[PDB]
Amino acid sequence: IFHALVFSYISFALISDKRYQKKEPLISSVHTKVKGIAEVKAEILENGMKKMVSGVFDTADYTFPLQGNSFFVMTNFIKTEGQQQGLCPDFPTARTICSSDRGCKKGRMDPQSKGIQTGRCVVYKERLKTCEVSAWCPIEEVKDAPRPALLNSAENFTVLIKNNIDFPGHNYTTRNILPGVNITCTFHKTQNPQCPIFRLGDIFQETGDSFSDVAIQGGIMGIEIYWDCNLDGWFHHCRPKYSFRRLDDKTTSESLYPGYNFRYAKYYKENNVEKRTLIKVFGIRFDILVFGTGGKFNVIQLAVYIGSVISYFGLATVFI
Amino acid sequence: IFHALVFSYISFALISDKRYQKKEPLISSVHTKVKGIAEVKAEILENGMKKMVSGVFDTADYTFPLQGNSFFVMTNFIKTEGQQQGLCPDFPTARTICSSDRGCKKGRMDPQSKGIQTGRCVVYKERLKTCEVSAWCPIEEVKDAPRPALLNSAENFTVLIKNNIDFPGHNYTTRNILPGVNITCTFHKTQNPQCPIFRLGDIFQETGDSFSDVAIQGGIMGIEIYWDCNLDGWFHHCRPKYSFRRLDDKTTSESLYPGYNFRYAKYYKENNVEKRTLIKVFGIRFDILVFGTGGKFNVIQLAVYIGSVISYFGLATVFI
Amino acid sequence: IFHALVFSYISFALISDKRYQKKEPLISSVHTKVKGIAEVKAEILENGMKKMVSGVFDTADYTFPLQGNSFFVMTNFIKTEGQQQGLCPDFPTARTICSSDRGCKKGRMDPQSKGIQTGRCVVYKERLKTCEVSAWCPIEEVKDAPRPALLNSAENFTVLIKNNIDFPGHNYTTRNILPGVNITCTFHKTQNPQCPIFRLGDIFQETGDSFSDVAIQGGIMGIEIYWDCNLDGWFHHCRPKYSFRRLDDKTTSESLYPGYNFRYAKYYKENNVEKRTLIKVFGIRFDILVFGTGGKFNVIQLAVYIGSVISYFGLATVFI
Ligand SMILES: *[C@@H]1O[C@H](CO)[C@@H](O[C@@H]2O[C@H](CO)[C@@H](O)[C@H](O)[C@H]2NC(C)=O)[C@H](O)[C@H]1NC(C)=O
Ligand SMILES: *[C@@H]1O[C@H](CO)[C@@H](O[C@@H]2O[C@H](CO)[C@@H](O)[C@H](O)[C@H]2NC(C)=O)[C@H](O)[C@H]1NC(C)=O
Ligand SMILES: *[C@@H]1O[C@H](CO)[C@@H](O[C@@H]2O[C@H](CO)[C@@H](O)[C@H](O)[C@H]2NC(C)=O)[C@H](O)[C@H]1NC(C)=O
Ligand SMILES: C[C@@H](N/C(=N/c1cccc2ncccc12)NC#N)c1ccccc1
Ligand SMILES: C[C@@H](N/C(=N/c1cccc2ncccc12)NC#N)c1ccccc1
Ligand SMILES: C[C@@H](N/C(=N/c1cccc2ncccc12)NC#N)c1ccccc1
Ligand SMILES: *[C@@H]1O[C@H](CO)[C@@H](O)[C@H](O)[C@H]1NC(C)=O
Ligand SMILES: *[C@@H]1O[C@H](CO)[C@@H](O)[C@H](O)[C@H]1NC(C)=O
Ligand SMILES: *[C@@H]1O[C@H](CO)[C@@H](O)[C@H](O)[C@H]1NC(C)=O
Ligand SMILES: *[C@@H]1O[C@H](CO)[C@@H](O)[C@H](O)[C@H]1NC(C)=O
Ligand SMILES: *[C@@H]1O[C@H](CO)[C@@H](O)[C@H](O)[C@H]1NC(C)=O
Numbered sequence: 011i012f013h014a015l016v017f018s019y020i021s022f023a024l025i026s027d028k029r030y031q032k033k034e035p036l037i038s039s040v041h042t043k044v045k046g047i048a049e050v051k052a053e054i055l056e057n058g059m060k061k062m063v064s065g066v067f068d069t070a071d072y073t074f075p076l077q078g079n080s081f082f083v084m085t086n087f088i089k090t091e092g093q094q095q096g097l098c099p100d101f102p103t104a105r106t107i108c109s110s111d112r113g114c115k116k117g118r119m120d121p122q123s124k125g126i127q128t129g130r131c132v133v134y135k136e137r138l139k140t141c142e143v144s145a146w147c148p149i150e151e152v153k154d155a156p157r158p159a160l161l162n163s164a165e166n167f168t169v170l171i172k173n174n175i176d177f178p179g180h181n182y183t184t185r186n187i188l189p190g191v192n193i194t195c196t197f198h199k200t201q202n203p204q205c206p207i208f209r210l211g212d213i214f215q216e217t218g219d220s221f222s223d224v225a226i227q228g229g230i231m232g233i234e235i236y237w238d239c240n241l242d243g244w245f246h247h248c249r250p251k252y253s254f255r256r257l258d259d260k261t262t263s264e265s266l267y268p269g270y271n272f273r274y275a276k277y278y279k280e281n282n283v284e285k286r287t288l289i290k291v292f293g294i295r296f297d298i299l300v301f302g303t304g305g306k307f308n309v310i311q312l313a314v315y316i317g318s319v320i321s322y323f324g325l326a327t328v329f330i
Numbered sequence: 331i332f333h334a335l336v337f338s339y340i341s342f343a344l345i346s347d348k349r350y351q352k353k354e355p356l357i358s359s360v361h362t363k364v365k366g367i368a369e370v371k372a373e374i375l376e377n378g379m380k381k382m383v384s385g386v387f388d389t390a391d392y393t394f395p396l397q398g399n400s401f402f403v404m405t406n407f408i409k410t411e412g413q414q415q416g417l418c419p420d421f422p423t424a425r426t427i428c429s430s431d432r433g434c435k436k437g438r439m440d441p442q443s444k445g446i447q448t449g450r451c452v453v454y455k456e457r458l459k460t461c462e463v464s465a466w467c468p469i470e471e472v473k474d475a476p477r478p479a480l481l482n483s484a485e486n487f488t489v490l491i492k493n494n495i496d497f498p499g500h501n502y503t504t505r506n507i508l509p510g511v512n513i514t515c516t517f518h519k520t521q522n523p524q525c526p527i528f529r530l531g532d533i534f535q536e537t538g539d540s541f542s543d544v545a546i547q548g549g550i551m552g553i554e555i556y557w558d559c560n561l562d563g564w565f566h567h568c569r570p571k572y573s574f575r576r577l578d579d580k581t582t583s584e585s586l587y588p589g590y591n592f593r594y595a596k597y598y599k600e601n602n603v604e605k606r607t608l609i610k611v612f613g614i615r616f617d618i619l620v621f622g623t624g625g626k627f628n629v630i631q632l633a634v635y636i637g638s639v640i641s642y643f644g645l646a647t648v649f650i
Numbered sequence: 651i652f653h654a655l656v657f658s659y660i661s662f663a664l665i666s667d668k669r670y671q672k673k674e675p676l677i678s679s680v681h682t683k684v685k686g687i688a689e690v691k692a693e694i695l696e697n698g699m700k701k702m703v704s705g706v707f708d709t710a711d712y713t714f715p716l717q718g719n720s721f722f723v724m725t726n727f728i729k730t731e732g733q734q735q736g737l738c739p740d741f742p743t744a745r746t747i748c749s750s751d752r753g754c755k756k757g758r759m760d761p762q763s764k765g766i767q768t769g770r771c772v773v774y775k776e777r778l779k780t781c782e783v784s785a786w787c788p789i790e791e792v793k794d795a796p797r798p799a800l801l802n803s804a805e806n807f808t809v810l811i812k813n814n815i816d817f818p819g820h821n822y823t824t825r826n827i828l829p830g831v832n833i834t835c836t837f838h839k840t841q842n843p844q845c846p847i848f849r850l851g852d853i854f855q856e857t858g859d860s861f862s863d864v865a866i867q868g869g870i871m872g873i874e875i876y877w878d879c880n881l882d883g884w885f886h887h888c889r890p891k892y893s894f895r896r897l898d899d900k901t902t903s904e905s906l907y908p909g910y911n912f913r914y915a916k917y918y919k920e921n922n923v924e925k926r927t928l929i930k931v932f933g934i935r936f937d938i939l940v941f942g943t944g945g946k947f948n949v950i951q952l953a954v955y956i957g958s959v960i961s962y963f964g965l966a967t968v969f970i
C-alpha cells in the first residue's frame with residue numbers, strides 16, 4: 011500500500027524534476043538596435059559662468075554597438091574643452107589647497123588628482139591657492155553632474171534585442187524572435203511578454219528604480235533572458251522569460267565611485283598645438299544575461315534514476 | 331545469463347557515457363589577429379551625383395580589437411560628410427512627405443527619422459516637400475548599400491584565433507595552439523582541421539552562405555570551438571573542434587533591421603563650426619563561441635553509478 | 651561492523667561532496683574603475699632621427715571602459731603621424747627589397763605588407779630599393795617597441811573591481827563588496843584577500859612574470875574570481891577567491907604575433923588633404939573570469955543519493 015505510494019511519489023519526482031531528460035547548457039549570441047533621439051536645451055555652469063547646452067543627439071551621439079552582451083546609453087555629460095599638455099594649478103579640493111610651497115612636493119601623485127605635481131603652490135582664483143601640476147590643462151572641474159540629466163529623454167528610447175541560442179549536444183538552434191510575429195509592439199509584463207521591443211523607462215519601472223535618478227549619475231541595469239527548454243515531443247516548450255534586475259550597487263559613496271561614468275577623450279590640433287577635449291560621460295549600461303537549460307530524454311539517465319529508485323524499493327520493503 | 335549481459339551493458343553505459351569521470355565546465359579566453367588589406371575603386375551616387383570612392387583599407391581602417399569574444403570586419407559603407415547641428419528638411423520617405431504645414435507637428439519624433447520636427451512643411455528638391463526637422467544637417471540619405479560591397483575583398487582576409495582554456499577544479503590549463511606547430515597553414519575541414527588560421531570566405535563556404543551577399547548589408551557569423559577533454563591516463567584527448575554557424579536571422583524585412591550595420595560618428599570643427607561625419611557601417615561580426623567539458627575519474631561518481639547499478643542487479647534478479 | 655563503517659564512509663562522501671545540495675551555475679557582471687597616471691619622458695628614434703617623447707597620460711589617454719568582462723591598459727606605443735593615401739616605397743624588409751622592376755608585380759599583397767604593390771621598384775633610402783605600394787603613406791616602420799616601455803609606471807596603476815553575482819534558480823543575489831567595508835586597502839594574498847583594490851605590479855608578481863617585460867610588447871593577463879557558495883543555514887559561506895593567471899602564450903615568435911598590440915587610427919584633415927595617424931598600441935589586457943557554483947539542499951538529490959547508497963547496502967551485505 012504505502013510502497014506503491016512511495017513509487018508513485020518517486021515517479022512524480024521523476025516527471026517534475028525531468029530526470030528522464032538530459033540537461034545541456036545554452037549557447038547565446040545577442041544583437042541589439044537602439045532607436046530614439048533626444049533634444050537637449052539646458053543651462054550648465056562652467057567655471058562659474060552660466061552657459062547654454064543645446065544640441066540634438068541621435069544614435070551615433072549617445073551609443074555604440076554592443077560588445078560582450080552589453081550596450082550603453084549615455085544620459086548625462088560634463089564637457090571640458092581645450093585641454094593641452096602643460097602646467098596648471100589643480101582644481102580646489104580639500105586635498106589640493108596649499109598654504110605655501112612646502113605643501114606641494116614635486117612628483118607627487120594623488121588618486122583624485124589627474125596630474126603630477128611640480129612642487130609649487132600657486133593661485134587658482136583670487137587668493138585661493140592650489141598645488142601646481144603637470145597634466146592636461148586646465149584640469150576638469152570637481153563638479154556634480156547636471157541636476158536634470160541632459161539626456162533625460164533616454165527613458166523613452168527603445169532597445170530591440172535579437173537573441174540566438176544553440177544546444178550543440180542536442181543539435182538544436184532557435185532564435186528569440188519567431189518568424190511571422192508582429193514586431194510593432196512594446197514589451198509588457200502581461201500584455202506582450204514575448205515582444206522583444208523594450209522601453210528603458212519600462213525596464214526601470216519593473217525593477218522599481220526611477221530612471222531619472224539613475225540617469226543623473228549613471229548606473230548598470232541588467233536584462234535577464236531565461237530559457238526553460240523541453241525537447242521530447244510528448245511535451246514541448248522553449249521560449250524566453252524576460253526579467254529585469256538593477257546590477258549596480260547603489261552605494262552613493264564618494265570613495266567607491268558610484269554610478270556609471272567614464273572619461274572619454276577627443277584629440278585634435280589647434281594653432282599648431284596638440285589639444286584634447288575631455289568628456290565625462292554618465293549613462294546606463296545594460297547587460298544582457300542569457301541563461302538556459304535544455305533537456306532531452308536520455309536512456310542512461312532514466313536507467314540511473316530507476317537504479318536509485320529500485321534500491322529505495324527493496325530497502326523500503328525492509329523498513330516496513 | 332541475461333543478468334551478466336545486463337551488467338556488461340550497464341558497464342558499457344558507464345564507459346561510453348564516462349560516468350566514472352567528473353565533468354567540469356571550461357574556461358575560455360580568446361585573442362584574434364586579423365591580417366589582410368583591401369583596395370577600393372567604386373562609383374557611388376551621392377544626392378543624385380555620381381562619385382568615385384577610391385582608397386586603400388588596412389587593419390586599422392576596417393576593424394578594431396576584439397571585445398567579448400567577438401570581432402568585427404567592415405565590408406560596406408555609406409559615408410555622409412559635413413553634418414552640423416541645424417534645421418533641414420527630412421529626407422523624402424512615405425512617412426516624411428508633407429502636403430502643407432498641417433502635416434508637420436512641432437516636436438514630433440519618428441522611429442525612422444533622425445530629427446525632431448519644427449512643425450513646418452518645406453521643399454527638399456523641386457516641388458517635393460518634406461517636414462522640416464532639427465538635427466544633424468543634412469539628413470543621411472535613405473539609400474541602399476552599394477550593390478557590390480566596397481570591401482568585397484573581405485572574404486580573402488585571414489583571422490588568427492588563439493584560445494586559452496582552463497579547468498580550475500582539475501587545475502589543468504591548455505591553449506588552442508600546441509607548441510612547435512607549423513603555423514603557416516589555412517584551415518580546412520579535412521586537410522588542416524587543427525590549423526587556427528581561418529579565411530572568411532572559407533568560413534562562409536562551410537556554412538553555405540555566399541560571402542558577398544552577406545557583405546553587402548552585413549551579418550553575424552559564429553565560430554564555434556568544441557573541447558571534448560578526457561583526463562585519465564588510460565585514455566586522453568583534449569583538442570578543439572572548429573565548426574561554423576551563421577548567427578544572424580536573415581529576415582530581410584525593413585521592420586526588423588536586417589543584416590549588421592551601425593552609425594559611426596567622426597566629429598571635427600570647420601570654419602569655427604562644430605561638424606560631424608556620419609558613416610553607416612556594414613560588416614560581418616564574428617562571435618567566437620567556446621564550450622567544453624572536462625572529465626576526470628571521481629571515486630564518488632563511480633561509486634554512485636555502482637550504487638544505481640547494483641539495485642538494478644537485485645531488482646533484475648527479482649524480475650526473472 | 652564493516653557495514654556500518656561503509657555507511658559512515660558513504661555519508662562522509664555525502665557531506666564532503668555536498669550531494670544533499672543542488673548545484674547551480676553562477677551569473678556574473680563586472681564593473682572596473684582604473685585609477686592612476688603616468689608621466690612619459692623618453693627618447694625614441696623615428697626614421698633614424700632621435701626624438702623626445704614627453705607627455706602626461708591619464709585615464710582617458712591609456713584605457714577605455716571594460717567590455718566583455720575585460721579591460722585594457724596601454725603600456726607602450728609607436729606613433730606614426732601624417733599618413734595620407736598615396737604611393738610610397740614599402741619599408742625595407744627581407745621580403746620588400748627589390749633589385750629591379752621584375753621583383754615587383756602590380757596588385758601583389760603580402761601578409762606583412764600594408765599596401766598593394768604597383769609593380770615598380772623604387773628607392774627608399776640611398777641606393778636601397780623597395781617595391782612601390784599604394785596605401786597610407788608613408789608606411790609605418792618595421793621597428794621594435796621602445797626598450798623601456800614608455801608607460802613603465804603602469805604597474806603602479808590601481809584597478810577597482812566590483813562583481814555582482816546571481817543564482818536565478820535559488821533566487822539569491824550578492825555582490826563582490828560587502829556593505830560597510832574599509833575600501834581603502836591594497837589587495838594582498840594574506841593581508842587583504844577580500845580587498846577588491848588591485849595593483850597591476852602585485853598581480854604580475856603573484857603569477858611570477860615581470861611587469862616590465864610584458865609591458866614592452868604587451869600581454870594578456872587574467873584575473874580569476876572563484877565563488878564557492880553554500881546556501882543551507884547549518885553552514886554558510888559565499889565569498890570570492892581571487893587568483894591570477896597569465897593568459898598569453900609567451901611564444902616570442904615573429905610568425906605568431908607575440909604579445910598584445912593593435913593598430914589604432916586617428917583620422918584628420920590637413921591642408922585640404924585626408925590624413926591619418928597610425929598608433930601601434932602595446933598594452934596588457936586583463937580578462938576578469940568569474941566562475942561559481944551554488945549549492946542548496948534539494949530533497950530529490952538527497953533521496954537519489956540515498957537510492958544509490960541503499961543498493962550498496964544490500965549488495966554490500968551480499969558481498970560479506
Ligand atoms: C517620453 O515621451 C512622452 C510622450 O511622448 C512624454 O510625455 C509627454 O510630454 C509632453 C511634453 O514633453 C506632454 O505634452 C504630454 O502630455 C506628455 N504625455 C504623456 C503621456 O506623458 C514624456 O515627457 C517623455 N519623457 C521624457 C523623460 O522626456
Ligand atoms: C581573393 O583572392 C583571389 C586570389 O588572390 C582572387 O582570385 C583571383 O582574382 C584575380 C583578379 O582579381 C584573377 O586574375 C585570378 O585569376 C583569380 N584567381 C583565383 C584563383 O580566383 C579573388 O578574386 C579574391 N576575392 C575577392 C572577393 O576579391
Ligand atoms: C611605483 O611607485 C613607487 C613609489 O611611488 C616607485 O618607487 C620609488 O621610486 C622613486 C623614484 O621614481 C624613488 O625615489 C623611491 O625611493 C622608490 N620607492 C620605492 C619603495 O621603490 C616605483 O619606481 C614606481 N614604479 C615604476 C615602474 O615607476
Ligand atoms: C561617440 C561619443 N558621442 C558623442 N556625442 C556628442 C555629440 C555632440 C555633442 C556632445 N557633447 C557632449 C558629449 C557628447 C556629445 N561625442 C564624442 N566624442 C560617445 C557616445 C556614447 C558613449 C561615449 C561616447
Ligand atoms: C576606425 C573606423 N574606420 C574607418 N575606416 C576608413 C578609412 C578611410 C576612409 C573610410 N571611409 C568610409 C568608412 C571608413 C573609412 N573610418 C572612421 N572613422 C572603423 C573601423 C571598423 C569599424 C567601424 C569603424
Ligand atoms: C584613446 C586612445 N589614447 C590615446 N592616448 C594618447 C594621448 C596623447 C598622446 C599619445 N601618443 C601615443 C599614443 C597615445 C597617446 N591616443 C589616441 N588616439 C587609446 C587609449 C587606450 C587604448 C587605445 C587607444
Ligand atoms: C542537426 O540536425 C539537422 C536536421 O536535419 C541536420 O541537417 C544537421 O546535419 C544536424 N547537425 C549535425 C552536426 O549533425
Ligand atoms: C500589430 O498589433 C497592433 C496592435 O497593438 C495592430 O494595431 C497592428 O496592426 C499589428 N500589425 C500587423 C502587421 O498586424
Ligand atoms: C596545478 O598543478 C601544478 C602541477 O605541478 C602545480 O604546480 C600547481 O601548484 C597546481 N595549482 C594549484 C592551485 O594547486
Ligand atoms: C608548413 O607546411 C607547408 C606545407 O603546406 C610547407 O611548405 C612548409 O615548409 C611548412 N613549414 C615548416 C616551417 O616546416
Ligand atoms: C526572491 O526572494 C525575495 C526575498 O523576499 C523576494 O522578495 C523575491 O520576490 C524573490 N524573487 C522571486 C522571483 O520570487
Ligand SMILES: *[C@@H]1O[C@H](CO)[C@@H](O)[C@H](O)[C@H]1NC(C)=O
Binds near residue numbers: 832
Ligand atoms: C582602513 O584601514 C587602514 C589600515 O590599513 C586604516 O589606517 C584606515 O583608517 C581604515 N579606514 C577606516 C575608514 O577605518
